[PDB]
Amino acid sequence: MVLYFIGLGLYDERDITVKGLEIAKKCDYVFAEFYTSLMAGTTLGRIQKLIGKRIRVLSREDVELNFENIVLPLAKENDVAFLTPGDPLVATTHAELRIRAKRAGVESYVIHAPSIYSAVGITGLHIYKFGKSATVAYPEGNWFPTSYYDVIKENAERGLHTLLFLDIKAEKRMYMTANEAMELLLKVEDMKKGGVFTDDTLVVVLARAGSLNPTIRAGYVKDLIREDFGDPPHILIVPGKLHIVEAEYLVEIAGAPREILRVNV
Amino acid sequence: MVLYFIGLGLYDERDITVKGLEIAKKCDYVFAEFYTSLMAGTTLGRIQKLIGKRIRVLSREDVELNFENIVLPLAKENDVAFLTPGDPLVATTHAELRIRAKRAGVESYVIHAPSIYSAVGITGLHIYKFGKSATVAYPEGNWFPTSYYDVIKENAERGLHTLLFLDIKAEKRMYMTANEAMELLLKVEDMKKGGVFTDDTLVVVLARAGSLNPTIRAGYVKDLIREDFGDPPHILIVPGKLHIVEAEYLVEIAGAPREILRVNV
Numbered sequence: 001m002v003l004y005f006i007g008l009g010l011y012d013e014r015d016i017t018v019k020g021l022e023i024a025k026k027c028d029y030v031f032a033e034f035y036t037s038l039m040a041g042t043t044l045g046r047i048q049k050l051i052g053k054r055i056r057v058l059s060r061e062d063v064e065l066n067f068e069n070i071v072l073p074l075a076k077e078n079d080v081a082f083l084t085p086g087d088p089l090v091a092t093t094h095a096e097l098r099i100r101a102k103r104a105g106v107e108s109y110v111i112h113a114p115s116i117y118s119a120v121g122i123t124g125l126h127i128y129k130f131g132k133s134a135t136v137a138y139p140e141g142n143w144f145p146t147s148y149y150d151v152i153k154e155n156a157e158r159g160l161h162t163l164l165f166l167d168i169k170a171e172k173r174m175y176m177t178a179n180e181a182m183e184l185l186l187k188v189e190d191m192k193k194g195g196v197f198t199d200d201t202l203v204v205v206l207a208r209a210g211s212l213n214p215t216i217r218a219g220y221v222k223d224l225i226r227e228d229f230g231d232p233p234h235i236l237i238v239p240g241k242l243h244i245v246e247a248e249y250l251v252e253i254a255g256a257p258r259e260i261l262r263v264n265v
Numbered sequence: 266m267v268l269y270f271i272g273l274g275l276y277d278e279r280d281i282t283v284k285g286l287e288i289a290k291k292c293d294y295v296f297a298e299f300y301t302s303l304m305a306g307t308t309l310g311r312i313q314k315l316i317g318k319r320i321r322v323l324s325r326e327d328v329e330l331n332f333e334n335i336v337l338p339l340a341k342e343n344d345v346a347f348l349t350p351g352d353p354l355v356a357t358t359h360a361e362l363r364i365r366a367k368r369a370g371v372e373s374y375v376i377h378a379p380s381i382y383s384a385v386g387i388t389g390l391h392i393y394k395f396g397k398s399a400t401v402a403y404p405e406g407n408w409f410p411t412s413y414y415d416v417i418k419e420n421a422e423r424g425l426h427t428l429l430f431l432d433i434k435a436e437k438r439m440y441m442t443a444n445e446a447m448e449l450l451l452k453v454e455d456m457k458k459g460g461v462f463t464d465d466t467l468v469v470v471l472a473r474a475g476s477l478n479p480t481i482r483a484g485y486v487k488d489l490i491r492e493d494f495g496d497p498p499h500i501l502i503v504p505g506k507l508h509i510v511e512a513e514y515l516v517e518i519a520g521a522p523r524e525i526l527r528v529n530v
């Protein structure tokens with residue numbers, strides 16, 4: 001009669017909360033989705049070993065089209081867990097699943113976990129200064145989406161930071177790198193000429209948040225565009241004007257050039 | 266030797282990540298602060314029992330004025346952990362503490378935990394649509410903070426949602442309720458008269474996120490301003506223009522008036 005939405009956290013199998021783990025262990029059935037994002041620091045096998053139960057993986061179609069035929073029927077007479085990378089319901093499509101549960105007469109509860117949305121606090125940038133967020137999508141064929149560029153423009157003009165989620169082909173486990181994102185943005189700039197993203201733009205790259213050894217780097221595009229930030233996942237942030245405290249953290253912790261202390265504050 | 270900043274999560278001792286728990290258990294000294302937020306579902310004793318270590322609680326003065334005199338000295342020859350509610354670097358000034366650690370020649374690591382900043386996803390509002398955030402602070406003496414009103418105005422004009430952290434005076438055991446925040450906002454509205462926050466404004470309240478049964482309510486200020494949302498902590502949200510699915514979730518899950526389903530595109 002109960003469905004638990006449980007977050008797995010940021011990077012590996014230990015990023016789930018104690019609450020999430022203990023509840024998952026006592027569930028009769030455990031399902032999981034890895035299409036909204038991936039858990040780069042672990043494997044399905046390691047998550048399964050930790051929880052001590054078979055993990056039934058579901059595709060985007062299984063969920064979006066058949067959630068009520070696959071998960072809810074069992075949740076009706078058993079305790080069922082639905083694992084998701086990060087924090088449940090951050091992904092835009094997850095919320096509606098609780099309405100499906102209600103419609104089916106199934107109680108649902110949410111067990112939170114760390115999300116990249118909040119983990120970016122490790123960049124030293126003040127969380128309250130983050131504006132609207134966006135996703136940088138790979139252009140394909142004759143389609144060249146650029147809405148993320150406008151998001152940066154609107155946040156930056158108001159002195160706000162912009163969190164940029166990078167494209168991920170979950171199924172193929174292929175990640176867009178911060179370098180690729182920077183090239184795209186430079187390409188978009190050359191087309192819109194909005195003076196939003198150039199070689200002189202200060203950016204912050206956060207890779208493998210959740211790991212004990214994430215890569216946190218800050219600097220100008222001209223210098224970071226060909227830098228190796230390590231294995232995925234990568235997150236790109238275009239900060240707005242900096243509070244001196246934010247700048248000092250970027251210099252001392254993220255290796256930012258001293259120049260940001262006088263150019264970006 | 267090393268210093269770990271470990272988040273404890275949203276509501277109780279089990280909101281800590283497995284990674285955080287396993288590391289805390291092996292530290293030589295464990296310190297913590299409980300003034301940045303309120304964990305309403307646990308006690309110091311329960312946290313101490315879970316980690317199996319005595320926890321030395323520090324006050325705001327201890328941290329802000331003497332972190333480098335109380336904590337860092339021990340981290341030079343021991344493994345030390347500093348625990349905090351929620352995520353250690355969200356809506357706190359703890360990031361600066363990493364700079365102090367560096368200058369003291371101490372390596373520091375960050376272990377994330379569920380944060381209210383991302384847990385708001387449980388309201389059904391799209392996380393990427395949240396703009397700049399703000400804090401509603403208690404007026405003191407002749408000083409009456411009003412910056413949060415302008416943040417709402419700015420976000421709303423862009424169609425973005427506004428997350429409002431509510432004030433806390435830990436040593437006095439005072440936790441601002443959503444009701445008190447709404448009352449303060451109505452007063453700022455009468456002063457600035459910008460039509461930003463009125464009796465007809467739609468708001469969302471999230472109380473005790475992290476618990477299995479948090480209070481999630483949506484409705485007009487005139488109806489919710491006197492409603493009992495239960496024990497603190499509370500967070501207040503002023504949505505921008507709603508997507509149809511956001512409205513559906515607020516109606517189905519947060520008990521919002523069915524009329525909001527009819528969005529004015």
Ligand SMILES: Nc1ncnc2c1ncn2[C@@H]1O[C@H](CSCC[C@H](N)C(=O)O)[C@@H](O)[C@H]1O
Pocket residue numbers: 275276301302303350351352353354355356357379380381382429430431432433471472473474475498499500501
């Ligand atoms: N479980 C919870 N439910 C509702 N609001 C919460 C909450 N935890 C924190 N808050 C809100 O956030 C304020 C503290 S701000 C510090 C937040 C913390 N670092 C985190 O990551 O969550 C509180 O006064 C309250 O308004």
